[PDB]
Every structure is written in structure tokens, then in C-alpha cells.
């Protein structure tokens, strides 16, 4: 219908952006016929402990697209507060209100540009992982090793 057409035309636009112009250290593309399983990656952050980490996540997009927000989970496996060991992310913005803060002015690539910033800047207070996030709060030196371990082992090839 018009509804499938408007994600469908605003799909392929992102897509095109995405390839063209994408945020800094943020690529998301399509490698299936499928315009709504689409792959995703995000280089680690200057001064993070994902330093010289590549991270794969997988982006879907609901039927609803965009008054449903992405489904997005890592595939490479991350060591954080507020992303759990089987890639899922805990973000406002992957999140319909009144909770969360999805809204259809979001887009792709501004959802990975806040799990980027995720990345840099825990929520260790609204943690997914408990012992993580207290390994974050009060053993800071603690979880940068481990996270640096983890980045070497899983985000490195």
C-alpha cells in the first residue's frame, strides 16, 4: 500500500545517504535482497577501551518503519554496562515513548551515531549488565582492562 511504498521510497533514500555520506566511523549497508536486514558497523572510539575495536551489529526494520524504531543488536560481542552477552542494546532511542525516546524524525544512521556515543558514555546507572556496570562505577581501572581484553578478543581480526 502508500504506507509500504513511504518506508519503501524512505528505505532506499537512507540507504543511498548511508552509502554517500555517512556519519564518522558509522557504516550501515545491504548485502541480501532484503532492504530491512541490513548489516551495520561501528568503529571503537578514540580514548575508549573499544580503541582499534571494528563492531558488527545487525539493523532490522520493523514493518512500521518509522513509527517502529530499528531493531538493532551487536553481533561482535562488546563489554559494557548497557549491552548484554547476546547483543542487546539498552538505548532510549531503541525505544518507543513513554519510556523510551524512538520518534520518526530519527533515522538510521542517528541511532548508530547514539550507540557510538553509548559506546563512549555508559548508562551505568540504568544497567543491563549489573556487574559490568559496578565493575564501571567502582573499579573504573577494572573495566577499562576488561573491556580492552575484550575489544582484543572479539573486535579485532
Same mark, same amino acid.
Given at each position: $500500500?502508500?504506507? +509500504?511504498?513511504?518506508?519503501? +521510497? &524512505?528505505? %532506499?533514500?537512507?540507504?543511498?545517504?548511508?552509502?554517500?555520506?555517512?556519519? #564518522?566511523?558509522?557504516?550501515?549497508?545491504?548485502?541480501?535482497?532484503?532492504?530491512?536486514?541490513?548489516?551495520?558497523?561501528?568503529?571503537?572510539?578514540?580514548?575508549?577501551?573499544?580503541?582499534? $575495536?571494528?563492531?558488527?551489529?545487525?539493523?532490522?526494520?520493523?514493518? &512500521? /518503519?518509522? !513509527?517502529?524504531? #530499528?531493531?538493532? &543488536? !551487536?553481533?561482535? #560481542?562488546?563489554?559494557? #554496562?548497557?549491552? =548484554?552477552?547476546?547483543?542487546?542494546?539498552?538505548?532510549?532511542?531503541?525505544?518507543?515513548?513513554?519510556? $523510551?525516546?524512538?520518534?520518526?524524525? @530519527?533515522?538510521?544512521?542517528?541511532?548508530?551515531? +547514539?550507540?557510538?556515543?553509548?559506546?563512549?558514555?555508559?548508562?551505568?546507572? =540504568?544497567?543491563?549488565?549489573?556487574?559490568?556496570?559496578?565493575? !564501571? %562505577? /567502582?573499579?573504573?581501572?577494572? !573495566? @577499562? %582492562?576488561?573491556?580492552?581484553?575484550?575489544?582484543? %578478543?572479539?573486535? &579485532?581480526?
Amino acid at each position: $500500500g502508500p504506507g +509500504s511504498m513511504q518506508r519503501a +521510497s &524512505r528505505l %532506499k533514500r537512507e540507504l543511498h545517504m548511508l552509502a554517500t555520506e555517512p556519519p #564518522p566511523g558509522i557504516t550501515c549497508w545491504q548485502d541480501k535482497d532484503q532492504m530491512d536486514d541490513l548489516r551495520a558497523q561501528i568503529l571503537g572510539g578514540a580514548n575508549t577501551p573499544y580503541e582499534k $575495536g571494528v563492531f558488527k551489529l545487525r539493523v532490522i526494520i520493523p514493518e &512500521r /518503519y518509522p !513509527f517502529e524504531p #530499528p531493531q538493532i &543488536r !551487536f553481533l561482535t #560481542p562488546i563489554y559494557h #554496562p548497557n549491552i =548484554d552477552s547476546a547483543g542487546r542494546i539498552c538505548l532510549d532511542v531503541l525505544k518507543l515513548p513513554p519510556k $523510551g525516546a524512538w520518534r520518526p524524525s @530519527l533515522n538510521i544512521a542517528t541511532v548508530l551515531t +547514539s550507540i557510538q556515543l553509548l559506546m563512549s558514555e555508559p548508562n551505568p546507572d =540504568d544497567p543491563l549488565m549489573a556487574d559490568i556496570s559496578s565493575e !564501571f %562505577k /567502582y573499579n573504573k581501572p577494572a !573495566f @577499562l %582492562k576488561n573491556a580492552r581484553q575484550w575489544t582484543e %578478543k572479539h573486535a &579485532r581480526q
